[PDB]
Each structure stands twice: as structure tokens, then as C-alpha cells.
Design a protein around this ligand. Structure first.
Ligand SMILES: CO/N=C(/C(=O)N[C@@H]1C(=O)N2C(C(=O)O)=C(CSc3nc(=O)c(=O)[nH]n3C)CS[C@H]12)c1csc(N)n1
Ligand SMILES: CO/N=C(\C(=O)N[C@@H]1C(=O)N2C(C(=O)O)=C(CSc3nc(=O)c(=O)[nH]n3C)CS[C@H]12)c1csc(N)n1
Ligand SMILES: CO/N=C(\C(=O)N[C@@H]1C(=O)N2C(C(=O)O)=C(CSc3nc(=O)c(=O)[nH]n3C)CS[C@H]12)c1csc(N)n1
Ligand SMILES: CO/N=C(\C(=O)N[C@@H]1C(=O)N2C(C(=O)O)=C(CSc3nc(=O)c(=O)[nH]n3C)CS[C@H]12)c1csc(N)n1
Lengths: 265, 265, 265, 265
């Protein structure tokens, strides 16, 4: 009956919807298109920050990174104001999560090092977490513009939910670094119209959004019930049949989240 | 499937839960003990105001009612501040809906006139709406104290939801009086932790609460989707197995509402 | 120059305005009718909670308080829904500050003990803080109704600011109790249209509001600059010349706060 | 008075600050080095779009401009994503205002035509607005690099504020083109930490930023009071004493804006 309502939303919004909520002790898993591939878009910036935190001590966050005007090749609301001043690693992590800063993600990818400007090392980090499906192949802004059917720069709701579960709820990160990642996502400024809009206000929601061409709109979140029980919610969508210029529908993710909230209440 | 989760809420909270959402063109009716009887408690105060509005011209709202300290019997946050000044019919209507003022409802019942302090005339008003099941037999605070199994001062989720549907969405009242009733319910101060707490913030919620002994906690609401689609939600509960002193559980109503929101999303 | 602009606000809004900001190391004191008396209204609920916290160990917050329908004499958005359940001292403190619950303040006054239902003991607590001007003489809701010129239930911007400074910035309370008082005021739900509205968003503002008859509208706040510099802001106003039914003007408090923010910038 | 606090900010941030707020019916002009010259930096891009709108019908917005990677020489977050596709004049206007795209400004200057890549024609356009002082002499990125004392690529807070006043509040443009310019500046992505950060959130702020060498940081804005009263605010700064590499300080402009908001309150 839940798949029937997801299918109605897919028809209402002319979209393909992917939802995954990992099973808990009390609740069964919610799976809609859990193993179909959807484009990361900016959702990769949350595990990216985890990759930077994982392989560096906390003192690395205070390292100052300098860059040029040539490095501003995508939507960079924070980095575009700090070409002359430079940006610390902590500010780049803060910027990548809370403002989805594209230049900040590229600098953090470079901070990981290796082939492809850090894209291979980020994929390797997901592999180390048990994610065998996901792959990052390009930097900003190219990774948002892969045509439908292309497996590059794609993940699945299943894979990204289990990744996010380990980062926030598991022990992929020590408690001090885990709290930083959680606080950045908790103070995100881009997800008000997605999973947060579909859950009651007394539920706590931390999230990282993704938006791209072909109507792509994603939101990955950890939510806590009023009783403090945590859940991982991955919602991914695109409108690829509507072409490159297809508009993303945030209301689709909000409605999908409301459906998920009904089963979790 | 939805009944399994309502019955799970009944089991979690040791309660009997009644839910009714009238069917629309797009949605099927939601029914969970929809025709079982539950005590009105203070939910009758919303149709009571409609009875007063329908029977009287608007100028009747300015009629001054004087009362003494002896007339205060139940929770009356407004009437207790106006013994010396008296209260206009409009103030009694405002107080009865928005603050669930018990003394205000008794004065409005008396304004209806007839046997039982207006309870026969109020019941007759429900009959004019097609509700042949519901009945009011006592005033505040006795109407909250009937033992389980007693049909007096009871309604059903089915009956009260259809009553509210006609008052707010239908044409039981002319538009000017309909707006007064609707705005009072929209600015209610007693329902923040019930149906309002179970719906996402971008859903508009107007409601009237009810609370009594035997763990009785009700909330009747009209809710509007983000796209402006209205739904009537009747949620009733009691915990009679815990005796007269059973405590109402507002969280039961919030969780039940979230389940309803999932089906309506 | 600043007093000329305070006087212009007084003329625009048909109001009497009181402002006090204690001097700091870098900034001089701001005073506009700083020692004239204004009605407390619900601003006393913040030092009231401080008196309860200071006089009792933290574990006292878990004591359950039971009350009756006769105790709901005032606007009590939280207490009115908990007659059957009771409320802990901690919940009453939360309700008194964040929802300005009138019954909760009366129950906390009773917890202080002594003559006048705690009004003498609360006043005595202010005396221990150096406040020789302020006085509480009635409970809710009477303390909001004193006519202009009556010194009862009045304070001054100077005195209430120095009280708030010691409670939040000083050592009137041990750090654990201080954090509870600060967090409650930080999550207050009643002050969005006053001092908070007059300061830039990157300034942190914690506040406790007061509103009454005779156009009375107060807001006492501790504000932190973007650089983390704290200031105490007390703004009090009434429109007593317009009578008992005079409407309070929240915009007066916001505009006055904006004037203060310019001098503190 | 107010000048004493601006000079305080000049000392705190080791900067030269220029402020101008045109007088209105209610307020007197605010002037602090209002007629001293400061470099345009990116602030000319707002009247630049007005020049392009003024000299052409709306259909000119749909003209496609093609360019190469060699034409990208400044911070160009949008133009670097459209080398292969090209961009319409309308997109160039959007990018120049909201993202301060340097390549977009050069293409729009070329669309104005004439010697110096359009700088003479843009200077002539300012003359048509009554601005006899300001001048643009170079393109991006050279216009940010003029040494102190050089009059090239300079304006004054007085002149540009009156220019902005005519473009947004006056009748320099027909209503449809004025609305496009207004909406573009309203949706700017570069000024969150400047004038916008210094005004309360309920003040509407549209702005155009400027940043260059020698610590140059400008922001020209139109702000609306909560009552809908508009004001033009020009805030310019440089820190030439710190050399070419002197860092701009955005907080200076936010603090100066807070000072302005206090007197406009
Ligand atoms: C005898 O009169 N008593 C009261 C009274 O109980 N006032 C209290 C007081 O100071 N309170 C405060 C608060 O903390 O400010 C508030 C918060 S102010 C407020 N009022 C609204 O109507 C609204 O929609 N939003 N907000 C934020 C509620 S009343 C209580 C009163 C209220 S208006 C009036 N003329 N009198
Ligand atoms: C080649 O890149 N194309 C992008 C792009 O830059 N994508 C990134 C991505 O996923 N980003 C995110 C985010 O984290 O969601 C965002 C936040 S989304 C957003 N923007 C608003 O202006 C707004 O008002 N609300 N919201 C929710 C910005 S783009 C970047 C794009 C943006 S819209 C579209 N059709 N394409
Ligand atoms: C919607 O519920 N939430 C509330 C709440 O209870 N609001 C109530 C509401 O509608 N209120 C009203 C009024 O009737 O206008 C008021 C006005 S009280 C009042 N006004 C007068 O003009 C007067 O002469 N006397 N008095 C006593 C304040 S809040 C309460 C709340 C309290 S604190 C907070 N953050 N929310
Ligand atoms: C006031 O600015 N605040 C921003 C911010 O920078 N918003 C920007 C804004 O207006 N944006 C826009 C757009 O141009 O429409 C977009 C879309 S950009 C885009 N659209 C397409 O259709 C497409 O094909 N490709 N791309 C790249 C998203 S946010 C950025 C912000 C970023 S995170 C946050 N909380 N705020």
C-alpha cells in the first residue's frame, strides 16, 4: 500500500522516486527504488566531509587553503567571497554541507588526493564503508550533468542510507568528528522544502540536499522521533524524461517524507 | 495495514482509538472504530457555537451575559477573569472554542434554552445536520464524567467528522458566520500537541480539543494540504481500563495524526 | 541624539518608552526613563524561575505538582492541558518562560512559599540581588491590571536589567542552573516581534516578554554580538493614556531595539 | 555623532569607510566621506545592466553571445559553465548582478560598444543619470587593481547612491525593465554578510557587492523598512594602507549598516 502511494507520487510529479529507510528493531525497511541508481548531485558532500575527517586529525581543520578565481567554476556562495582571504578546511567542510558550496567540495576532494582530483579516493572511502554500488567520477559542476542511464556519479537510496547510518549513528567516525558532521548537517540551510517539510515539527531532521539537471532533487536525512528514536531516510528523484532542463520538484520529496513518517509514527 | 498501526498505537498507549476522515474525490475514507461511541468532552463546544450562530443574528454576539463565581465549575481560563464585567456572547463563543472555557459553553447552552440547560436544543441542532447518533445530556463538568458504556454525552468519529465538515467546508452556516467559527478554531490555543503536532507545519490545521476522565483525549480538525486540499480528521481516544483517574495521552493523538497524514500525502 | 529618537518613537506610537542597557568595558550605558516605574507583567517569570532554581537543588525540578481546574485563573497554554497529569517543577519553569504560562508562575510562586503566595519571597529574592526598587504584590492575572501610577507589581528598566545581568552573565546562579535559565529564554516562543526583530539575525537574543493592559509591552533580553560580546537590553513601554483597552505596540520595541543595536555595533 | 562611530569602525578594521544615505521626506542624509572616491569594483555591474536595458528593447535579452575560455579572466561562476553553449544577454545580466560574474560584465560592456571595451559608453550612461563624478576605465579584472589616489574606475558613495536611487526607485527605466533589475538585485547571492547582515531580517534588502584589491569591499543597497519605506544605502571601504594584498573586511560593512539602521529606526 506504501508502494502504491509512491507510484501515485511518481505519476503526480512526472518523476522517478527512490526511497530507503533502513530497518530498525521495531520497524521494517522501507524500499521503493532502493537499488536503482540515482545521481548523487550534492549529497556526496556529506560523506566527502566524513572522508576528510576520517583520514586526518582534528587539527587539520585549521589548515588554511588558498585558491584562485579560476577555481570558482560552480555555485559557491561562500568560497566566492573568500578568494582573497582563503578558506580553512573547517570552513570548506561547513560550506560544503550547509551551503552546498561547489568550490568547497572540489578543494576537499583535492585534499583527499590521488587520481581524478580526489574522486577515486572518495569512492575508495565509500568502499571501505561497505558501499559497493556508489561511484564518484567527476568534480563540480560536471557530476550533476550526467545523462540518464549513465552510472557515473550515481548512488542508490539503499547504499547512501547505509553510508549515512554509519557516519551519524554508527562508529565510522570517533565521537568528536561525528559530532562535527552532525552539527553541520543539523544547521543545513538548503533542505527546508524537502524531508523537513514532510515531517512534523517535533521530529528532529538533519539533512544534506542534492539538486541537478534532469529534474534531479535528492535529500538524505537522519530523523529523530519525538521519543528520540533515530531513523535514516534517503529520498532520491529525477525527471530525466523531461530533458536536461526538467525542473526538480521539492514537493515530491516532502510528500514522500510524509508517507514515510506515517509508517514510522 | 493502516488498522494494524492504529491497533499498535492502542496497544502502545493502552487506549481505545477512534479515527474518521471523510472520503474525498481523490481519497478513500479512513475508518478505525469510526462508529463506536466516545465522549464528546469539549469537542461539542465547536458545534455549540454553530448552534448559537445559526439561531441568532450577528448582533446577538454583542449581548452581555453576567454571571457569578458560583457559575464557574470547570476549566474556565477566560470566564474567571470577567465575573465583575460579564462577557458578551461573542466572547463566550471565542472562549469556548479557543480556550475550551467550560463556563462559556454552559452560558451558551443556556442561551440555546430549554430543558437540561440547552442540551436538548443542542442535540436537536445536531439532528438538523443529519447527525442522529450524537447526544449531549449534561453541562460542564459532568459531561466529561460519564462511565464507559454510557451513551450520554457521546458522539462517534464518523458523526462528529461529518458535522464539522458541514460547518467549515459546507454551507450549514452563511459565509460570514462560517468565517467566525473557522477563525476561532484556527486560533485555538489548546491543540498544539494533538492533531497539529502530527501534521507537517506546512499543513494548516484548525481544531477543537476534548479532554475528560477515563483517559479521554479528543481532537477534531479540518486540515489543508500544502496545495490547499481540505480534509476533516476526527480522532477520539479513552483509557477506560485505567479507571476514572486514567490520564489522557496527547501523544496518541499526534501519532495517529501522523499516520493519517501519511495516507493523505 | 539617541534620546531624541526614543522621544520620536514615543510620539509615533503614543507610548511611554523605557530603555536600559548596562555599561560594558567598551560601551557606555544607554538610559531612557531608566528609573521610571513600568509594570512587570510576565517579565517577572524569568527571575521567578531563578529564585526557584537558586533555592533548590536540580533534582527539585522532577517533583510532580498537581493542581485543579480552579487554579487555571489565567492564560495557561501548557498548564490547562495537564490538570489530570500534573506538571513537574521543571515543566512549570519551562512553561512560565517559553509560553508565559500564568498558572505555572502561580505554582512556582507557591513553591517559593511565604506570605502572598510567594510574592513576598520572590520580592525578597530580588532584594538579595541588590534590586531595591522592584516589587511583586499580586499573582496572575492581577499583576497585569494595576492602573498607571500604582507602584505595585512594577520595576524599572535599570533594576530589571541589572537583575537579568547577574542571572545570565554573572554568578547569581551556579553554571548548571544558569544554563537551564538561559536555554529556556533562548527557546522562548513569545519574543520574535520585539527585541529579536530589531537586531540583525546574526546577533543571538534570549528574552522574556511581558504584555498587559494599558498598552503594556515589555521585553528583557541578553544579546550577543556576532563577535560574542554580550549586552543586557531592557525595553519597557505602556500606552496608559489610552486606557485599559489600549493596544500594545510590539513594533515600538523592535524599532527601539534597532536604535540600541546601532549604538552597540 | 554618527560620524564618531563610523570613525570608530575605521579604527577597529583599519579601513577607510564611505557611507551615503540620500535624504527622504522623513530623514536627513547620512554622510561619511560621501564625496571621496572609492573604486567601483563589482558595483558598476548594476548600472551596467541598466545601461544595457535602457539602450535596447526587451527582445535584446534573448540575443545569444558566444565566447571562449580565453575571455574568462575574473571570478565567473556562471560563464565558466557555458563556454560551449554561450549565454544570452539576459543570462549575462543575471550572472553579472546575482553572481558578480566578471566575464558577464565584460560581454555586456562589449554589448554597449565603443572604445575601451564599452567603458566610455558606460561612463556616458552614468552622465545621462546626472552622475558627473564616476568613471569606468578598465574591464575585469583590471578595474579592481587601480592604486589608491587613482581616479580611474572610481565612484563616490554620494554619486552611486543617487544612481541606484534613480534606477530602482526613480524613472530612469520603464517599469518592466526596472522590475527585472530590481528582482535580480533582490536575488543576489554575494551580499549575505554585508548590508544584509547589518539590517534586521524584517527589513528587505536588495544589493550589489564590490570586492577588489587593497582591502576594497563595497555594497550598494536599497532597503525597505517594515512599514515599506525605501532607503538607498551605499557603503564602501578600502584598506590601502595594508597594500595590494590587504584583505577586505565584510564585517565592517555589516557593522556600518547596523549603525545606519539605528538612525533610520
Ligand atoms: C490581565 O491580563 N493579562 C494578560 C496576560 O496574561 N498577559 C501575559 C503576558 O505578559 N503574556 C505574554 C508575554 O509574555 O508577553 C504572552 C506572549 S505575547 C503574544 N500574544 C499573542 O496574542 C500572540 O499571538 N503572540 N504573542 C507572542 C501571552 S499572554 C501572557 C494580558 C495579555 S494582553 C493584555 N492586555 N493583558
Ligand atoms: C551543474 O550543477 N547544477 C546545479 C547545481 O549546482 N547543483 C548543486 C546541488 O545539488 N546544489 C544544491 C543542493 O545541495 O541541493 C543547492 C541548494 S538547492 C536550493 N537552491 C535555492 O536557491 C533554493 O532557494 N532552495 N534550494 C533547496 C544549490 S545548487 C547545488 C543545479 C542547481 S538547480 C539545477 N537544476 N541544477
Ligand atoms: C495559539 O496558542 N498559543 C498560544 C496562546 O495561548 N495564544 C493565546 C491567544 O490567542 N491569546 C491571546 C488572544 O486571545 O488574543 C492573547 C491576548 S490575552 C488578552 N488580550 C487582551 O486584549 C485583553 O484585554 N486581555 N487579555 C487577557 C495572548 S496569547 C493567548 C501561545 C502562548 S505563548 C506562545 N508562544 N503561544
Ligand atoms: C541568496 O543566495 N543564497 C544562496 C544562493 O546562492 N542561491 C543561488 C541562486 O539564486 N541559485 C540558483 C539560481 O540561480 O536560481 C540555483 C539554481 S542554479 C542552476 N539552475 C539551473 O537550472 C541549471 O540548469 N543549472 N544551475 C547551476 C540554486 S542556489 C543558487 C544559497 C545557497 S545555499 C543557501 N542556503 N542559500
Amino acid at each position: 500500500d506504501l508502494a502504491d502511494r509512491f507510484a501515485e507520487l511518481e505519476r503526480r510529479y512526472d518523476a522517478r522516486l527512490g526511497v530507503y529507510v533502513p530497518a530498525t528493531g521495531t520497524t521494517a525497511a522501507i524500499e521503493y527504488r532502493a537499488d536503482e541508481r540515482f545521481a548523487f548531485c550534492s549529497t556526496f558532500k556529506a560523506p566527502l566531509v566524513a572522508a576528510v575527517l576520517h583520514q586526518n586529525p582534528l587539527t587539520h581543520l585549521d589548515k588554511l587553503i588558498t585558491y584562485t578565481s579560476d577555481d570558482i567554476r560552480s555555485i559557491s556562495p561562500v568560497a566566492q567571497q573568500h578568494v582573497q582571504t582563503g578558506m580553512t578546511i573547517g570552513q570548506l567542510c561547513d560550506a560544503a554541507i550547509r551551503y552546498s558550496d561547489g568550490t568547497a567540495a572540489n578543494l576537499l576532494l583535492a585534499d583527499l588526493g590521488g587520481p581524478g582530483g580526489g574522486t577515486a579516493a572518495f569512492t575508495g572511502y565509500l568502499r571501505s564503508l561497505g558501499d559497493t554500488v556508489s561511484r564518484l567520477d567527476a568534480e563540480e559542476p560536471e557530476l550533476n550533468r550526467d545523462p540518464p542511464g549513465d552510472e557515473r556519479d550515481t548512488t542508490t537510496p539503499h547504499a547512501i542510507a547505509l553510508v549515512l547510518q554509519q557516519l551519524v549513528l554508527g562508529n565510522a567516525l570517533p565521537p568528536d568528528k561525528r559530532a562535527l558532521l552532525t552539527d553541520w548537517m543539523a544547521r543545513n540551510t538548503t533542505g527546508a522544502k524537502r524531508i523537513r517539510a514532510g515531517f512534523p515539527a517535533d521530529w528532529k531532521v538533519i539533512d544534506k540536499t542534492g539538486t541537478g539537471d534532469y529534474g534531479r532533487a535528492n535529500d538524505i536525512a537522519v530523523v529523530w522521533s519525538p521519543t528520540g528514536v533515530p531513523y535514516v531516510v534517503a529520498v532520491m528523484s529525477d525527471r530525466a524524461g523531461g530533458g536536461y532542463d526538467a525542473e526538480p520538484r521539492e514537493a515530491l520529496l516532502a510528500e514522500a517524507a510524509t508517507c514515510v513518517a506515517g509508517v514510522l509514527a
